């Protein structure tokens, strides 16, 4: 009965999706055609998600075991098997969830510098026509948005505070069964980094995996002064300095 050893689990608008293409084509490595499912993150939800566009997270989300079952149905012979959802890491009962059935599950985590994660998830919305708003306008109604029960893709700063989120994985699935990485990292050097992945998942590293408009300023700054004590109390729960998230 094939079912999943490893989650990648966010952040939203982190690149994980560029991330799950590359370890789904190594041959120990199957991740079903299936994004967003949210199975361990669905009694986090609120009754309805309100926001315009945000009928994928009420429709193509699945919350039924039987169903999450069968995403692997097509799992053959891979060592590692794994599902990608971006909210994972949000939603605050998740990781309990999952250890509950799965304790020996490992947790990829990506990060990107929140100021920038914030404006990829406006641009976002925007090319997809459900925010008309500009960016300035748009993070103003974020409190507002939360209330009214819109989706996480809108809530620019409560889905960049990461510290939070990360300690609850470690806390829950300890520092062996977690690995963090950095966008940054990943896109300067995405061979390397899906090797690393490949390490942590206990797969083989000979693997070459196939790799083939501005915020305004003053707004740069105050983002970045909002999520520096954050970020601040991260680096000290992943063991790595930020400081290229100050630049
Ligand atoms: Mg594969
Ligand atoms: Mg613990």
Redesign the pocket.
């Known amino acids: 009965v094939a079912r999943p050893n490893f989650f990648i689990v966010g952040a939203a608008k982190c690149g994980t999706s560029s991330l799950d293409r590359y370890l789904?084509?190594?041959?120990?490595?199957?991740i079903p055609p299936k994004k967003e499912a949210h199975f361990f993150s669905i009694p986090d939800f609120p009754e309805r998600f309100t926001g315009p566009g945000d009928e994928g997270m009420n429709l193509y989300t699945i919350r039924d075991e039987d169903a999450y079952m069968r995403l692997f149905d097509g799992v053959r012979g891979?060592r590692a098997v794994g599902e990608a959802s971006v909210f994972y890491l949000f939603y605050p009962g998740t990781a309990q969830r999952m250890y509950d059935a799965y304790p020996d599950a490992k947790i990829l985590i990506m990060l990107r510098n929140p100021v920038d994660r914030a404006f990829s998830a406006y641009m976002h919305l925007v090319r997809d026509e459900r925010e008309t708003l500009s960016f300035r306008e748009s993070l103003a109604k974020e409190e507002e948005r939360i209330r009214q029960h819109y989706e996480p893709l809108w809530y620019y700063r409560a889905v960049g505070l990461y510290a939070a989120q990360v300690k609850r994985y470690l806390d829950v699935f300890g520092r062996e069964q977690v690995k963090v990485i950095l966008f940054e990292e990943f896109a300067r050097d995405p061979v390397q980094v899906v090797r690393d992945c490949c390490a942590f998942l206990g797969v083989s590293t000979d693997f070459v995996p196939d790799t083939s408009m501005e915020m305004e300023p003053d707004l740069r700054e105050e983002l970045t002064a909002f999520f520096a004590p954050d970020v601040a109390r991260l680096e000290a729960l992943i063991h790595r300095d930020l400081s290229a998230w100050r630049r």
């Open positions: 789904s084509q190594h041959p120990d490595i199957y891979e």
